[PDB]
Amino acid sequence: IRVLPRFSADGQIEMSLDIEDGNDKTPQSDTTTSVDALPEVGRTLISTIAR
């Protein structure tokens, strides 16, 4: 997370967000491609502004 908070005039909080949530997807373990440098990575990126 990378955030930049700021108070408005009414007391609400506006934020500038940069969210990433990733993990490691695993292929079949029985085949040879599990011992080389193939970590299939799946990510999820969100960039917006909310208040």
Partner: peptide, 12 residues
């Protein structure tokens, strides 16, 4: 400034 941001915004 009460309702906006100074400075640039960056994304990819």
């Amino acid at each position: 400034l009460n309702n906006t941001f100074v400075g640039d915004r960056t994304y990819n």
